[PDB]
Design a protein around this nucleic acid. Sequence first.
DNA 1: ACTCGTCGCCCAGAGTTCACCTTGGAGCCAGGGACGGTTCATTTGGGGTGCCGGAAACGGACGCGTACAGGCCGTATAATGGGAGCTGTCACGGATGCA
Length: 88
Amino acid sequence: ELSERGEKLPAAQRRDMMWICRDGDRAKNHLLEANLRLVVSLAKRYTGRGMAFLDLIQEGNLGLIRAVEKFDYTKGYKFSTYATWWIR
DNA sequence: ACTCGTCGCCCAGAGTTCACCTTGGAGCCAGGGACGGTTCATTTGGGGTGCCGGAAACGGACGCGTACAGGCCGTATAATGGGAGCTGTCACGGATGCA
């Protein structure tokens, strides 16, 4: 929003924004790497027809990325229950 | 004691060839119609036509609805590292990981 029709952000006011953005991206990556195990556990069930195990795994990672993007913690629900639908 | 089978013989004839009159014709030419292949006048019953009036089918154009086909999107107790594959060959020149 500030990029166009904003203000010239000083170093003090911009470094905080950059740091919190990087922290958020790092947290997203951490959650992805944590839930990859659920991804592979879910994807183990569709082998033997059509595609390969690695292809199924990568599709599971894509679904996990989508679920992480569309997750909502305010509902007070465990992440696996929501992510299973997207992975499937 | 004797003839009817068979021999020549003698005359009528007959149809045959020679060599004679007649007389129905083959053409042969002349002459004279009527007739039809031909030509030339009509003759107006009929073929023809161009054309748009124009009525109407018709073949397509055009604008606007409808239908499945394929595509995108989402489902909130929990669900967190995998099946498997069958391997009795022989030689061998050489790279290559560990000697």
